[PDB]
Ligand binder design. Structure first.
Ligand code: CL
Ligand code: CL
Ligand code: CL
Ligand code: ZN
Lengths: 168, 252
């Protein structure tokens, strides 16, 4: 179901997700892979996916996504828990550009994302400011920019939030 | 849990999104407004830190890295810009006939060292000419160029790109083309005696010049013998070389 949701989310863009994990015991292994080939420009709704993954689980967890330069393409790997092997992005809200050389990786955990968010003074209200990854694949390099994105019409967002609240 | 947890605030929306796919799509696609459109940077600034859609701004207001999509100047320059790298190579090789369009580029070397060997040394690194051509074709017409030897490298050549005005703007298309073309070199923004200058110097492994066909040196000299330079441009280049003589860029 998570793969279906993710493809539905990425239907806007051209990124390709690779094709049944369970909530009470969430997997430490990779749960999804997203691929973007050379010359492509596409955005990845990072924070949205993280928050979605954390919603999916019914136990405390720290969702993490890794971005790698395969050397032919860009790869996104999804985790419910940040691996010991997993790298982190040395970025701030103001300066958020990361250049990946071949076989090199970066990463973002939801917790440290929250730390960056608070440090930046970024609005924490839901769906008011979501960190996304602007991804330009340009071999031998992968260009990343972790930019906070806001809604086109906030009013519409609140209405939607209100409805959602009524459901519960 | 001690503090209403993440998704606690985000829980209703996500349940609703599980219920409503279309609304989810609308929501995720709706997040298209960047909160930070420009960010200040400090010199010396390595242009390699900029992604494809980033533009650069240099002025008395400071130095900024901006989002090209949200840029008015970029928007203004946007219609006339379309890339032809193989064409860059073609222009380099067939420059001999079309010397006229690139006069200033030659004038510089002609100003510093009219010898054939000097012009040969300049022609040894084509990516410099790639830089000049990309910058000129990008609307930065009145750019001037300087050539120095690299002190922090063995037998390597450095090229200074000096801008005429006190306000400079490098389009994201032009910047991307520039970084793409000069894959063998590094380009760093600097300021020297109130003059904004892009420093292009060779980096790392391999010599890129081996991967481009050789070009006639004595023939370009022969052609140059006929050519009539402005003469004010040459003296301009004399004082420019004099001014940047004590200029010392940092280690790579
Ligand atoms: Cl920074
Ligand atoms: Cl430098
Ligand atoms: Cl400097
Ligand atoms: Zn701009």
């Amino acid at each position: 179901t998570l793969v279906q949701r993710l493809k539905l989310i990425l239907s806007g863009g051209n990124l390709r997700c690779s094709d049944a994990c369970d909530p009470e015991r969430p997997p430490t292994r990779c749960v999804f892979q997203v691929h973007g080939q050379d010359g492509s420009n596409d955005t990845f709704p990072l924070e949205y996916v993280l928050r979605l993954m954390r919603s999916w689980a019914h136990v405390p967890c720290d969702p993490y996504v890794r971005v790698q330069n395969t050397g032919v393409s860009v790869l996104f790997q999804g985790f419910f828990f940040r691996p010991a092997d997993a790298p982190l992005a040395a970025i701030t809200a103001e300066h958020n550009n990361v250049i990946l050389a071949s076989t090199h990786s970066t990463g973002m955990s939801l917790s440290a994302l929250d730390d960056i968010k608070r440090a930046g003074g970024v609005d924490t209200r839901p769906l008011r400011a979501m960190m996304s990854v602007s991804c330009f694949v340009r071999m031998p390099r992968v260009q990343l920019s972790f930019r906070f994105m806001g809604p086109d019409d906030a009013s519409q967002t609140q209405r939607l939030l209100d409805r959602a609240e009524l459901r519960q | 849990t001690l503090t209403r947890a993440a998704r606690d605030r985000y829980a209703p929306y996500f349940a609703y999104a599980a219920a409503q796919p279309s609304d989810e799509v609308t929501t995720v696609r709706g997040l298209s407004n960047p909160l930070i459109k420009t960010a200040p940077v400090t010199l010396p600034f390595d242009l390699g830190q900029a992604v494809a859609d980033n533009c650069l701004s240099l002025s008395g207001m400071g130095y900024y890295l901006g989002l090209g999509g949200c840029c008015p100047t970029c928007a203004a320059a946007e219609p006339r810009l379309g890339s032809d790298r193989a064409a860059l190579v073609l222009a380099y090789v067939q420059q001999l006939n079309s010397i006229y369009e690139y006069r200033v580029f030659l004038a510089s070397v002609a100003a510093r060292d009219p010898s054939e060997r000097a012009l040969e040394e300049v022609l040894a690194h084509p990516e410099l000419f790639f830089a000049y051509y990309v910058l000129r074709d990008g609307g930065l017409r009145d750019v001037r160029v300087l050539f120095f030897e690299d002190p922090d490298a063995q037998g390597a050549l450095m090229m200074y790109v000096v801008f005429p005005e006190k306000s400079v703007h490098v389009h994201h298309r032009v910047l991307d083309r520039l970084l793409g073309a000069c894959a063998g070199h590094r380009i760093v923004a600097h300021v020297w005696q109130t003059m904004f200058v892009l420093v292009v110097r060779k980096k790392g492994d391999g010599r890129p010049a081996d991967d481009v066909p050789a070009v006639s040196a004595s023939d370009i000299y022969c052609k140059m013998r006929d050519i009539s330079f402005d003469g004010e441009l040459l003296l301009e280049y004399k004082r420019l070389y004099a001014a940047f003589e004590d200029f010392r860029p940092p280690r790579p």
